[PDB]
């Protein structure tokens, strides 16, 4: 079933190699695009496809965390002198071992004195004492990772085809890997070692995930990286993720719970007689009602194809680019001849909608029909075909044979509200063949839990 | 009044287009600079000017905020048992409705017990009770915006001029827009559709505003974006902007005021008899005496021409680059001929000063007189002309006709303290024409409010 | 002892300069790599070496800070009414002047009432009073600096050599400086002013230190910049560096100590009779046992050669790149001839190990023996020579004469655990000369202080 990719139309620059005090070469220069192919014959058709663009972020920090289910049970003591409900019993301490109660649960005590005598005597100033309880919700487990400045790699696919009696035959097929952060990188591509591929980047990739805190879910086991305010290992913000952390054993606890609990737990007596109180947690990312989970970066970020922790060693994360800038190629050899070939660009029809998504992304959700090669778009002013061009684009369909593909076209802010015409034309197609349609514009836009003790009072009068 | 821009001197690379199993083209390649023009004739003079470079950041978060005017009124109760000044009346509660008092005001209550008996009896431990009041200052309103990784666009200006009887005539004039983050983008430029402009970026722009929190003022209505420590929607740091937020109705409130007020308001009794107390707010960005407003990015950042929220929909912000890297151009056609033209570079005189600004920017505040084209500078070691060159620069004046322009020249750290010579020479000018001057070096460098209640005590003994 | 650098093998593109209504030039185009040289003769051998790549970050914020040695002495008062240990004496106040005690010490008082009567009477509720003391540890002093978006400069070395009777003679030798963030920069290189060097960057450097907070040690005096969670001037997080700040005089104090001390100091009575208590600081970066110092960026970050505050004025920091992308060069002249030369690439042997360091860096710690020029590596699948290639690299040794050098080779994540073969071959060397070795894989991975007062109680009953 062996078949070459669509050979793109690329201008070629003939450069001449410098010389030493010896025996007069030449280099063939061109700019290859990501997710496109280049074809040539040596005077067996040679093809190179810039398949993948990846960033390899080192993982500097790591820590497992979860989402806690919080429950607070209190008790009031009317007499400020009483032995029950005290600083030594409640202030900065975990409620001692119940022996039967769950191993997964994690509790912390807080001391609330200087109360108002409601359902009490006018002179005696009450005191409140609470057990803040935390257990994992739905057994949700995530790894938190600190991704720092990456190394960039390009992945090329070298294939050599032959036309033997009516059909194509993939003779040789390799994967070429080249580091893009330094100078030129050079290697032979064919088995015959006659030809050399030289890859050079202009500067940094058009895109790169920002150095920061990331995470993904764990299935008792890595998954698609997400981004939501998360705490660096050394930080403990209660409004950001990771204050409920998993230790070695698999036991979850509130990071410096003992000490911090009194700054994040706030309770006031409603009536000491009925044993009623107002309670809250001055935090986020807890259950109930304080936790929603952000979708993977892949989903929300069009430039991202995938963003995942590479393996079980948890040392690097790989960001696979969906959109990237071209790379500079030079093909060199002794002294022979090189000719570059290119298939034609075609298009039957297209469909799509202009959308501003919930994450503020302005794109044209384009779908091409029976298409191949380089396809040129022109976004128009009004609904009228022939109105003024406001943006001009070029999409590249990688299929040798005309097929139906779906793609995302980033648009400038000039492509504002209201429906408008868009005109697609393949490469070197007469303006009679140019398909036009009126495209639609869509746009997506962007506490106290009062309880009566329940457990009853053991110390009434 | 139709006139072409200064046609820059640019080397042109002749590349040959690849071929298919059909009918032997050619492509003209060159690197266009931002704020410069390129001229050519087809064998009507064709001109292309790289006019604008813009980043289009999606706005992920949004919230209106203000600056609060804070006022705290207190009262002391000598007897720790008293019904006046209590946890239920003061701890975690907004002072109930006054019915006459301002709608714009926002108040919060705090409870300060366990006091020292100053102007009281040696055994009874006092208690203090305060109403922290907040109202907008000068009706100042700002939108807070979260700018994330942008899409880059180039804006070109295509104009075709003709010389009809002594004067130039702008025949055709278009605006070309090309996305710079992906592969090559291609479109026709002339009405005749004979010529095609192909734009390719090397990698990311030399500059890009960092993903973070930004804001600008609102005039009851967007303005020039500023940068000052500001809170992300989900965060509530009191030392950073946006803790005083505007809801739907236009009412400003302290974000989670009720709960947090006791962590940020700190008061101690001075004398319970005279009703004197020491008061403070453990926050920033409040009035009086705790608020200065950072100038727009445009002002402080030389690389920024403008940074503004694009429109009323508040979905994207546009950063217009003042300084940027060159773009790769290729002009292609059937088979005809292309010749590139360039006007000469001139300079009468210059003036300027070497400055290190308050924001640590080392630049040469250059002013050119009766100048056009490419102008070459050479910064010298000492005040002596002919001393060793320490930096070499090239500025490009876009005016066809010699005019007076002012510009910013970024300098390395080697261009240290003390006055020195700088020598300017236009392109291809003999070293006799080279203007020299000794340039001057300038350098810019980088709580408790105690009150006696006033309202008097209603509860004396 | 004058000697040229290894002249690299570089393809040269012949471009033709545009023309005006006057007298037909030409430009020689090539991509120079960082830490490599280019050689040519004009028809005295001319050499240009891209020596240095630097980022010049402006320093927007500055503040000296230290590391504090913390000591807390307390005292308990059993009777809640007592004149000793009070809100006025302890809450939000510095312990008044001792007159003899150290000038370097900085103390703060905290008030802990509503205690439990341990070693006391069942009805009287105690109170605790502490003096938190802070002094510099080991007289450690550091400057905190805010580095913002930099300006990029390239530093070239132009040298012209002559071969006079058996040996080379360095005739002319200059340092060329070119700004990389804008358009093309142009200057003459030779004393004869015949030749012009034109430098153009594709986009941003492959690497750039992130805008943020940095610091380095001071020797009573700048040093190698480090990175560790540090507070921006306006922020006061106790879990991050710089809360212990040095004022003008050289006196260190806790940033807003008075006010914050009660939020970060937490103490509970153990027994009021014996005068025993549990004490802690809810902070980081303090002594004892809460401070380790991060190594310089140079050490941890392979892409960084050096990162240092430039000088005594403390206005800019210079980041010297160890790894960077190529720059675009064009050499132009009247009308004459240019020929480019290149020495050969050689290699005797090599040694090294594949390492994943503590900071998650995957690299090949390569050491070359009797080597010069362009050296090509091929990382193999298994230990077997001849197994499948998984990565391909190219290193450039700058020595004209074959010497022994050590280098860092960034590797993709595909180069996983276990030993494997790596094959090095110089440029244009037959596959017989290719040295192979099996290389080893190494991998580095990533509270309450209870005291009895000691000072004794002055107020027993
Ligand atoms: C795509 O382009 C290639 C390369 O130009 C074409 O390949 C030729 O295939 C035929 C049979 O169709 C042979 O007889 C030729 O010798 C091939 N050329 C070379 C240079 O090896 C190809 O057919 C085109 N395909 C489509 C689907 O448009
Ligand atoms: C700038 O350069 C242009 C293009 O080389 C010059 O344009 C010519 O204008 C004259 C009249 O002055 C005509 O007779 C020519 O045919 C034009 N050339 C082309 C190629 O169309 C121009 O005059 C120069 N201007 C300045 C102010 O220096
Ligand atoms: C490196 O390359 C240079 C340049 O090609 C060689 O330089 C020549 O030196 C010899 C003496 O050895 C002279 O007679 C030539 O005229 C030089 N050439 C030029 C163009 O000026 C050089 O010897 C080579 N060196 C090594 C160590 O390999
Ligand atoms: C998860 O809790 C579940 C129920 O939600 C239980 O089946 C299981 O033993 C727990 N284990 C882990 C490893 O999360
Ligand atoms: C986007 O494009 C694909 C392909 O046509 C389709 O599944 C989907 O409906 C589109 N979504 C929107 C919102 O246009
Ligand atoms: C493309 O979709 C259309 C129907 O909308 C049809 O012309 C065609 O069969 C589809 N698939 C391919 C591979 O051409
Ligand atoms: C602003 O307060 C002013 C006085 O500063 C008053 O004229 C006005 O009604 C207020 N309105 C808004 C919308 O800010
Ligand atoms: C900078 O340049 C302009 C133009 O000459 C002028 O308005 C201004 O005085 C200059 N400022 C300084 C500080 O040199
Ligand atoms: C430039 O300024 C000078 C005076 O400093 C003068 O030569 C000239 O008239 C000015 N303007 C133009 C457009 O040349
Ligand atoms: C540093 O403390 C030392 C001992 O560690 C003492 O010799 C000296 O006077 C102090 N001075 C400064 C400037 O740090
Ligand atoms: C890295 O390379 C150098 C040079 O051979 C050597 O000093 C050192 O042992 C190496 N370290 C490791 C861990 O391989
Ligand atoms: C390189 O090291 C080896 C020994 O490991 C030896 O061949 C040689 O003398 C050394 N130095 C140079 C400059 O060649």
TrEMBL record, chains A, B, C:
Q: Which GO terms describe its biological process?
A: cell-cell fusion; egg-laying behavior; embryonic body morphogenesis; locomotion; morphogenesis of an epithelium; nematode male tail mating organ morphogenesis; nematode male tail tip morphogenesis; nematode pharyngeal muscle development
User: According to the UniProt record, which cysteines are disulfide-bonded?
Assistant: 7-39, 74-130, 76-272, 78-120, 85-129, 95-107, 423-436
Q: Which sites does the entry annotate for glycosylation?
A: 139, 365, 404
Keyword Membrane: yes or no? yes
Question: What are the annotated GO cellular component locations?
Answer: cell-cell contact zone; cytoplasm; EFF-1 complex; plasma membrane
| Keywords, comma-separated and alphabetical | Kinase, Membrane, Signal, Transferase, Transmembrane, Transmembrane helix
Q: Give GO terms: molecular function aspect only.
A: fusogenic activity; identical protein binding; kinase activity
Q: Which domain of life is it from?
A: Eukaryota
Name it.
EFF-1A
From which organism does this entry originate?
Caenorhabditis elegans
**Which gene is the coding source of this polypeptide chain?**
eff-1
Part of the full-length chain shown: 34 to 560 of 658
């Amino acid at each position: 079933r062996a078949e070459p990719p669509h050979c793109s139309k690329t201008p070629i620059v003939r450069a001449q190699t410098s010389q030493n005090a010896m025996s007069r070469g030449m280099q063939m220069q061109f700019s290859i695009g990501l997710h496109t192919a280049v074809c040539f014959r040596l005077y067996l058709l040679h093809t190179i496809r810039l398949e993948k663009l990846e960033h390899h972020h080192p993982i500097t920090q790591r820590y497992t965390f979860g989402i806690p289910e919080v429950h607070a049970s209190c008790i009031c003591e009317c007499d400020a002198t009483s032995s029950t409900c005290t600083a030594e019993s409640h202030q900065f301490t975990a409620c001692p071992e119940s022996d039967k109660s769950d191993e997964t649960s994690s509790c912390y005590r807080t001391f609330f004195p200087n109360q108002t005598p409601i359902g009490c005597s006018e002179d005696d100033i009450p005191k409140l004492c609470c057990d803040v309880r935390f257990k994992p919700y739905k057994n949700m487990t995530f790894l938190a990772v600190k991704l720092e400045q990456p190394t960039t790699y390009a992945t090329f696919v070298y294939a050599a085809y032959d036309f033997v009696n009516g059909y194509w035959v993939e003779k040789d097929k390799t994967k070429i890997r080249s580091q893009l952060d330094g100078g030129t990188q050079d290697r032979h591509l064919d088995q015959k070692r006659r030809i050399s591929l030289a890859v050079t980047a202009g500067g940094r990739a058009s895109h790169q995930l920002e150095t920061g805190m990331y995470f993904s879910r764990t299935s008792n086991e890595t998954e698609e990286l997400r981004m939501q305010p998360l705490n660096e290992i050394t930080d403990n913000n209660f409004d950001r993720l990771g204050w409920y952390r998993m230790d070695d054993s698999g036991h979850f606890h509130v990071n410096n719970g003992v000490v911090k609990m009194d700054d994040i737990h706030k309770a006031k007596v409603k009536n000491c007689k009925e044993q009623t109180y107002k309670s809250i947690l001055s935090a986020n990312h807890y259950m109930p009602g304080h936790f929603n989970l952000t979708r993977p970066l892949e989903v929300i970020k069009p430039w991202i194809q995938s963003a995942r922790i590479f393996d079980s060693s948890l040392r690097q994360a790989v960001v696979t680019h969906a959109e990237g800038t071209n790379l500079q190629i030079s093909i060199h050899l002794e002294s022979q001849n090189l000719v570059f070939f290119h298939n034609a660009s075609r298009i039957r029809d297209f469909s799509g909608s202009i959308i501003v998504d919930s994450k503020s992304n302005r794109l044209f959700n384009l779908t091409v029909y029976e298409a191949s090669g380089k396809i040129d778009g022109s976004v128009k002013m009004s609904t009228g075909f022939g109105s003024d061009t406001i943006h001009t684009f070029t999409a590249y369909v990688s299929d040798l044979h005309a097929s139906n593909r779906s793609m995302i076209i980033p648009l400038p802010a000039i492509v504002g509200q209201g429906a408008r015409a868009i005109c697609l034309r393949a490469d070197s197609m007469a303006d009679i063949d140019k398909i036009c349609h009126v495209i639609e514009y869509f746009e997506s836009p962007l506490i106290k839990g009062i309880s009566s003790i329940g457990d009853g009072v053991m110390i009434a009068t």
